[PDB]
Amino acid sequence: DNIIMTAYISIFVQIITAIISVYGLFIPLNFKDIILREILILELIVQIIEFIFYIWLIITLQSINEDITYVRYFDWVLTTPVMLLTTVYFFEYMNSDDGIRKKEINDRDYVYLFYICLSNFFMLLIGYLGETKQINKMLTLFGGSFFLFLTFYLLYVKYTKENWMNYIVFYFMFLVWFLYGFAFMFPFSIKNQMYNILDIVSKNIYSIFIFIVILNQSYKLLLE
């Protein structure tokens, strides 16, 4: 009952977040702030993949004859790299006194961003091998956690500055992603309830956060 229930809740919050996000795209910004729009567009692309998974889940859960948790990885392998890119864009936005856009960041940092996504890919591959019972759960937790910590280390040392704004965003995101590893430990029903709620936080709450930053910047523009 509780997987299907939390899946419907997720889908509700997905639809509300998509509405807020699309409105966000239209809100007037200074040219130096337009990377926030670039971020919201990528978050909406993520939402397309998330939605297809959640519709598949609610339809499929009617009649299930195996642990289908592994199917989430077909979503994660596409969405998590995009989410790491939008995190980099936000930190660069936050920490750049000068206007910066994704083209300039992508062109300059291509190699480093590739390695962030490669670390993240190895995390997911180890998780997938664990989820499909090809390696034991302890080895999965250790190997997956190693690559999670490597991904966030790479993010930290290149893209953070030493102030409260940076610590708050970085460490909240880190905790949320860590809890996907925590969830891995749990039996099928509890694990999938946890993933259903975590997706709301990692994906949808991030989009709403970006929307709020856009609202704040647009108001400054209106007032000036």
Residue numbers in the entry: 2 to 225
What does the literature reporting this entry say, word for word?
Phylogenetic analysis shows that, within the rhodopsin superfamily, viral rhodopsins form a monophyletic family that consists of two distinct groups, VR1 and VR2. Here we present the results of a comprehensive structure-function study of two homologous proteins (61% sequence similarity) from the VR1 group, OLPVR1 (ADX06642.1), and VirChR1 (TARA-146-SRF-0.22-3-C376786_1). In this work, we demonstrate that VR1 rhodopsins are Na+/K+ selective light-gated ion channels that are inhibited by divalent cations. VirChR1s have proteorhodopsin-like architecture with short extracellular loops and share several structural features, such as membrane-associated ICL2 helix and an unconventional TM6-TM7 orientation.
Type B hexagonal crystals were grown at pH 7.0 using a monoolein (MO) lipid matrix, have the P1 space group, and contain two protein molecules in the asymmetric unit. Type A and type B crystals resulted in the obtaining of the OLPVR1 structures at the resolution of 1.4 and 1.6 Å, respectively. OLPVR1 molecules are nearly identical in both structures (root mean square deviation (RMSD) less than 0.2 Å), so hereafter, we refer to the structure from type A crystals as it has the highest resolution. The interfacial interaction in the putative dimer occurs mainly in the TM4 helix and involves several non-conservative residues, namely E108-E108’, Y111-Y111’, F122-F122’ with low surface interaction area (429 Å2). Strikingly different from other rhodopsins, the intracellular parts of TM6 and TM7 helices of OLPVR1 are significantly moved apart from each other far enough to form a pore. The pore is located at about 8 Å from the cytoplasmic side of the lipid membrane border and connects the inside of the protein with the groove on its surface, which leads further to the intracellular bulk. Surprisingly, in our structure, the groove and a part of the pore are occupied with a fragment of the lipid molecule, a host lipid of the crystallization matrix (MP and MO in case of 1.4 and 1.6 Å structures, respectively), which is likely to be a crystallization artifact and is discussed in more details in the Supplementary Notes.
